[PDB]
Design a protein around this ligand. Structure first.
Ligand SMILES: Nc1ncnc2c1ncn2[C@@H]1O[C@H](COP(=O)(O)OP(=O)(O)OP(=O)(O)O)[C@@H](O)[C@H]1O
Ligand SMILES: Nc1ncnc2c1ncn2[C@@H]1O[C@H](COP(=O)(O)OP(=O)(O)O)[C@@H](O)[C@H]1O
Ligand SMILES: Nc1ncnc2c1ncn2[C@@H]1O[C@H](COP(=O)(O)OP(=O)(O)O)[C@@H](O)[C@H]1O
Ligand SMILES: [Mg+2]
Ligand SMILES: [Mg+2]
Lengths: 486, 469, 53, 467, 128
């Protein structure tokens, strides 16, 4: 009998096989059970091995025979995945046939060092006015989306994914961005409706949906983010730009906690093992922006976190807040009073800042940020409204209009030039003479008007990437003429 | 095979075998019991020992008793014969009318539908309740949750939903009661028998009750959910027909697992829950789904321990529902019944494309006005209400009117309120709330809207109050 | 009387705001103490369960 | 001697020697890795087994791999050739610029200088920054908290301190980026190269960068602070000079220690922190002192969890801080740089005995006038400015002039302001503030003071702005 | 030693809040069951046995004495924390040093409202 390349299960239960033998098995290596089940060897102890089973332990009796595959976990990669729905190991689950990818990568590879990177400078257009102007996201960033239940996080992610269609349907090649959507611990029907939604907007010809749903064993949910991040590192390391969305990263932490507590590792705070920082840090540190010597590719990341009762001092929320380059808070109080997306712009930040904003959006959002900052510190009066000087009155009459410009609708991202035009109209002052309730209508009208007649101006703003004084004057004229006839 | 009990600790029995070993989830029958005791295997500890959870009280067990491996997981009767009956966790009837004679048996443990088998259609399911239909419309084939503290209206609301929908349903129905009062189980059984839904004489019953009430040891409360789910699975697949599945409660399915976890030899998780809470609940909630080959309109009541929606159990369940109606204790204190919280109940079909532009605009208007009122209450704390401006006194008055109008009298609450239960079709609710928002009822007192159906009834009640004044 | 009333309301609301802030000081200290106590208690329960098995 | 990996549980590796065990804290090199994995010993389990914490990923470790006992704790190069070179915990250079060539090697687990070696007179490191050197003076061989997050001038302030100390004292600097984001580490490296503190050509760099990345196992983020202290201790003892030691962040140091202790299986302390939090902080903080050969002055960026200053981490840290500098956004908006908050900033050596009577009195006067202006700002905002006495208006003028005078131009932020940088010596700062307070300059405009060095330069600006 | 050889001694423990932390470390590393704030239940006997030696022997026992001045440090000035109350119930008095009187320049910052000495007027110079 062989007890180096083969072993036999001493015990099983709750998904943690204890194998005897496998003396030559490496840590974090993929063994295979006699029942066609795979597993990952995590605990190497003097007397046994702790294998986490990728599936149901109903099929793993005691005394089974386990054979080591000799390789660390690896996933397929390539442009053959685009538009597919794969599970935590690259197996298709959309029933469209075999994936047919030549290459492979290791899930647990290390991040690029200090020299390969270069400072984040390109803008990653999310197509959401609030995000694109007040909390911008560059390429190579890691911008946490942290919120409560049903506040609109998955919608921010899907609007971002849908928006890139305008770039991917063009001919410019360094603006093309390929999206990956890792869905961890989600009801399958949610992922099915999401894939349908992406197909509707035709945004599923450059998207890879990695699916690790609720029924899936804990190791698959713990492993899905790394599978997705590897499929994204493939595009990063080939001069292409990627955008990976983990949704959520709290459920990966829960799955990892289950694995650990069943392997009997020292609990720690909230029963989370000691590696729930290492776990997430060594994942989010793979979102980079390689310098030209390494291809110039990039890989953005938008981890999604759910916070219970807006408690952002919990364990995992703070672990992932101290790793990332910003955060986009989504408070529900704002959600229900009309502000949708409910991006609380006081708590939201982007440590990258305006270094990742197009010169036009810089030109405009630079002053919009200050106007809203001033409004936010006299918001309380808003109810009293009167009884105050013209100074604060004008402050909170500009703030209300600016706020109502940032409202937006499901699955309808706006091109950067159009956001710039709307914010220009709103902030230069061509709206302070308008009843707030009508602002939205004006927007939804003005936008269309500009789209129809003045396409040349929008093209010039898009290409020059700046509001030249000639374009500035032409835009002022357009706004004045339209606002006159409203 | 045949093993012998080796240890008994609480509801956890360790059994030793010398023949082959029974795989996990198998059912083992203990030999020498007056009533069938079934142990479900849960672990393999090595040395041909298996740890097991006893589906029924382990009193009177002796070290060394003999245990026979049935050879397959707990198998239960299924088919159109279980309609009108009541079943154990292990399937044996508990309504004293003879055996459930079926051709079909099903194992309560089975994998969930694959991703390629899901449906993606959504059509509103009118329930006749103003708040539910207006703010968080349900959906045919969707999973629905009622998150409640203790004594807020989960059970009365789910009885109202049964009475409304199950009676007017073409397909079958199932009510799996997991670990809740036996008084309630008997009450429901008699209510159905007296309402014609169940029929003792002939074969015309549309409900297949299953009960694991709170006197069952934890091994049983943690599995009756799977039994009701198996009956519904059959009706969904083999009959190829629409199904309803009411579960009450789905917290006890988690609580029982927590109860046995420590003895099973597992380090406890955050709040004393088992480390496997999330997966032990996903493997269940992932079988309650519509598919291309059927449809289940599952409704589930969910205890929220101490009204703490941030507890791990409800917090984890929130992700498995297509629509949640968070009953609230604060609203129930104001007397508004159902206590549904308008600013916490959500839905997935509340979109301008699925329910229509006007429905969506009205729902969002209701929510926004209520939120504005919530903000204003803080100022009313200090100023008083005489000081409020004249655009806000209107806001407060309208918000109070809308709060009252969201209340409704159910047909199953006639015992409490005395009023007559009402059903308000969708059009009536949307029109009434449109009018209340527009200001077409600033001249009626707010108490005119308390516990009435359509808006015209509020007008009539206002007139009657005026006359009797 | 109008001038006197407005000055009095200014003073009264200033005093009320100062009282509220002075109360929030103690409430915040108590909240932080209780939060740490909750974390410690939950952790001790977990490790005491882990040791017991 | 060579042992054999017997167990591998996460980042904790149990090795089994057969001839003789290595004392605790030794470094072991695993044989068979493409990279160099170093395990630090942590316990002596018995049966010739030692439990150890890995400095790198322990993926791919077989049960039986040979592990060679190095023979001493982690040893790093501590020559003067480190300056301008990035290195990681185990001493390798992570800037892919070639090996760090040094003739000296230092073991990172040292002990605090004995009682006899301690210096007894409390000096005052002169950073050359007016606000820092007047209201919250820094002390040689003292620990200095640095509050304030991003967008306030933390990196520019760090660079200015590095430059001024290297220029007005001849003492180099070390930057131990514990738990350093790779993006932020690269940005800091390039900012330093641009600003001249690091120079890649002429071998006159004034900074030694050590980076413990955020994606390294906890066993590595908990020791990088000791690598920084090792380099700086060399510069203090074997080269007898004052040193600066920046630690960004100091919270991540305690957190890394906490994770390591949890991994080893130790009962967590009060709020989940390790039981050894106090002494883990002490062994590190107690090597930052002013012995009889030199001094290490540590500037420790501090993060306060949950805005809770009584949390065990900041509670333990603040027992060692000798001063505090509070960078505040509300003063970057007003255009005053550095953003140092003159009132939140404090110091232990604001004692007439330590800093002197004139310095103490000037600092107290500036604080008093600034508090008075802060109090009067509300009244000006409510009752109006026209109802302030002559003395009140005079104090408002003085306070605005002092506020503007605290601002200074930094030689490393020239590209932003364009103004040539200045290094104000202590005595000139005291003189300028004495004169401003006494009223000698009541007859100059406010903007004459914005972004000027000595006071005489302010007078020159006042003249040139009316000509 | 002095107290038992007829002399008078004064001992200043500074701090006793940083001995209880060392004892908590020792206990938790011994695996002892943590209690309130993770302190072992023993954390009282630790200070009681130490401070009960600050006695004052009568003339038939030499007549020496040993005054003790333990120094406790309270986070956010919470006098009702665990160790502060453990020691407030072992000692014969207390001197509360407010952190806001201190910040007003009133130094030393004794909070005479709360400070007390339970031998007080006894053993005070008559003139004073
Ligand atoms: N920009 C928006 N405009 C209007 N409605 C929105 C917007 N974003 C989100 N919503 C609404 O909020 C609801 C919840 O959205 P979403 O699923 O994005 O939140 P979530 O955080 O992903 O929910 P969960 O936490 O349950 O996954 C949706 O029904 C959607 O209609
Ligand atoms: N629609 C209603 N009308 C009047 N009273 C109600 C209504 N719903 C609930 N109640 C009151 O609240 C109590 C809540 O009980 P119930 O909802 O049956 O149990 P649960 O605790 O599961 O919610 C009921 O006993 C009833 O007195
Ligand atoms: N003395 C100064 N002169 C001009 N600009 C400054 C000064 N101090 C800070 N700033 C500005 O404040 C910003 C803060 O960025 P920096 O301090 O470099 O990073 P961080 O905010 O992470 O500390 C800088 O971009 C800089 O332009
Ligand atoms: Mg979501
Ligand atoms: Mg109930």
């Amino acid at each position: 009998v062989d007890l180096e390349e083969t072993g036999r299960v001493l015990s099983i239960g709750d998904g943690i096989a204890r194998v005897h033998g496998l003396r030559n098995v490496q840590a974090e290596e993929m063994v295979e059970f006699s029942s066609g089940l795979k597993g990952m060897s995590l605990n190497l102890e003097p007397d046994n091995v702790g294998v986490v089973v990728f599936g149901n332990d109903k099929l793993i009796k005691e005394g089974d025979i386990v054979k080591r595959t000799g390789a660390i976990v690896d996933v397929p990669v390539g442009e053959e995945l685009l538009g597919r729905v794969v599970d935590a190991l690259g197996n298709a689950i959309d029933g469209k046939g075999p994936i047919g990818s030549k290459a492979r990568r290791r899930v647990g590879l290390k991040a690029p060092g200090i020299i390969p990177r270069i400072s984040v400078r390109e803008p990653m257009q999310t197509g959401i006015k609030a995000v694109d102007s007040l909390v911008p996201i560059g390429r190579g960033q890691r911008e946490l989306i942290i919120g409560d239940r049903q506040t609109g996080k998955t919608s921010i992610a899907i609007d971002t994914i849908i928006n890139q269609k305008r770039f991917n349907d063009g001919t410019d090649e360094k603006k093309k961005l390929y999206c990956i959507y890792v869905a961890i611990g989600q009801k399958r029907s949610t992922v099915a409706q999401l894939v349908k939604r992406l197909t509707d907007a035709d945004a599923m010809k450059y998207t890879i949906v990695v699916s690790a749903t609720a029924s899936d064993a804990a190791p698959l949910q713990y492993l899905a983010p790394y599978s997705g991040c590897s499929m994204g590192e493939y595009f990063r390391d080939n001069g292409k730009h990627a955008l990976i969305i983990y949704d959520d990263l709290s459920k990966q932490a829960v799955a990892y906690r289950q694995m650990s507590l069943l392997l009997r590792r020292p609990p720690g705070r909230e029963a989370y093992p000691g590696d729930v920082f290492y776990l997430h840090s060594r994942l989010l540190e793979r979102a980079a922006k390689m310098n030209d010597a390494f291809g110039g590719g990039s890989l953005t990341a938008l981890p999604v976190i759910e916070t219970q009762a807006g408690d952002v001092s919990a364990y995992i929320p703070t672990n992932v807040i101290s790793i990332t380059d910003g955060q986009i808070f989504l408070e529900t109080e704002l959600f229900y009073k009309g502000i949708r997306p409910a991006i609380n712009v006081g708590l939201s930040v982007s440590r990258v800042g305006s270094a990742a904003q197009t010169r036009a959006m810089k030109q405009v959002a630079g002053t919009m940020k200050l106007e809203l900052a001033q409004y936010r510190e006299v918001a309380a009066f808003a109810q009293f409204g009167s009884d105050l000087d013209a100074a604060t009155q004008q402050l909170l009459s500009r703030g209300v209009r600016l706020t109502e410009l940032l409202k937006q609708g499901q699955y309808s991202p706006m091109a950067i030039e159009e956001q710039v035009a709307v914010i220009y109209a709103g902030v230069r002052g061509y709206l302070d003479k308008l009843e707030p309730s009508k602002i939205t209508k004006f927007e939804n009208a003005f936008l269309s008007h500009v789209i129809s007649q003045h396409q040349a101006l929008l093209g010039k703003i898009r290409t020059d990437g700046k509001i030249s004084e000639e374009s500035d004057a032409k835009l002022k004229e357009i706004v004045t003429n339209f606002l006159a006839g409203f | 095979t045949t093993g012998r009990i080796v240890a008994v600790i609480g509801a956890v029995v360790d059994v030793q075998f010398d023949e082959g070993l029974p795989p996990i989830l198998n059912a083992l029958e203990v030999q020498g019991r007056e009533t069938r005791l079934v142990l479900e295997v849960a672990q393999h500890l090595g040395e041909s020992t298996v740890r097991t959870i006893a589906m029924d009280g382990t009193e009177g067990l002796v070290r060394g008793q003999k245990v026979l491996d049935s050879g397959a997981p707990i198998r239960i009767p299924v088919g159109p014969e279980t309609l009108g009956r009541i079943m154990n966790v292990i399937g044996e009837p508990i309504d004293e009318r003879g055996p459930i004679k079926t051709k079909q048996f099903a194992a309560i443990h089975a994998e969930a539908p694959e991703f390629v088998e899901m449906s993606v259609e959504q059509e509103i399911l009118v329930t006749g309740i103003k708040v539910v239909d207006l703010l968080a419309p349900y959906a045919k084939g969707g999973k629905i949750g009622l998150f409640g503290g203790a004594g807020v209206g989960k059970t009365v609301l789910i009885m109202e939903l049964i009475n409304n929908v199950a009676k007017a349903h073409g397909g079958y129905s199932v009510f799996a009661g997991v670990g809740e009062r036996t008084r309630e189980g008997n009450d429901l059984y008699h209510e159905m028998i007296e309402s014609g839904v169940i029929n003792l004489k002939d074969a015309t019953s549309k409900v297949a009750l299953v009960y694991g009430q709170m006197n069952e040891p934890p091994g049983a409360r943690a599995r009756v959910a799977l039994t009701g789910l198996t009956v519904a699975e059959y009706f969904r697949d083999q009959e190829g027909q629409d199904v309803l599945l009411f579960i009450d409660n789905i917290f006890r399915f988690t609580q029982a697992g927590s109860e046995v976890s420590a003895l099973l030899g597992r380090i406890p998780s955050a709040v004393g829950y088992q480390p496997t809470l999330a997966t032990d609940m996903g493997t269940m909630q992932e079988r309650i789904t519509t598919t291309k080959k059927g449809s289940i309109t599952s409704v589930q009541a969910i205890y929220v321990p101490a009204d703490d929606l941030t507890d791990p159990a409800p917090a984890t369940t929130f992700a498995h529902l297509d629509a949640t109606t968070v009953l609230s204790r604060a609203i129930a204190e104001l007397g508004i019944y159902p206590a549904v919280d308008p600013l916490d109940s959500t839905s997935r079909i509340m979109d301008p494309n699925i329910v229509g532009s006007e429905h969506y605009d009205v729902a969002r208007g209701v929510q926004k006005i209520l939120q504005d009122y919530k903000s204003l209450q803080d100022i009313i704390a200090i100023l008083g209400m005489d000081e409020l401006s004249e655009e806000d006194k209107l806001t407060v008055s309208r918000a109070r009117k809308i709060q009252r109008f969201l209340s409704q009298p159910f047909q199953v609450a006639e015992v409490f309120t005395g009023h007559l239960g009402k059903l308000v079709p969708l059009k009536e609710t949307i029109k009434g709330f449109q009018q209340i928002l527009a200001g077409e009822y600033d001249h009626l007192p707010e108490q005119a809207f308390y516990m009435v159906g359509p808006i015209e009834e509020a007008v009539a009640k206002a007139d009657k109050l005026a006359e009797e004044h | 009387s109008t001038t006197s009333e407005q000055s009095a309301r200014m003073t009264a609301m200033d005093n009320a705001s100062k009282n509220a802030s002075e109360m929030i000081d103690k409430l915040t200290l108590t909240f932080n103490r209780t939060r740490q106590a909750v974390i410690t208690k939950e952790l001790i329960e977990i490790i005491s369960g882990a040791a017991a098995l």
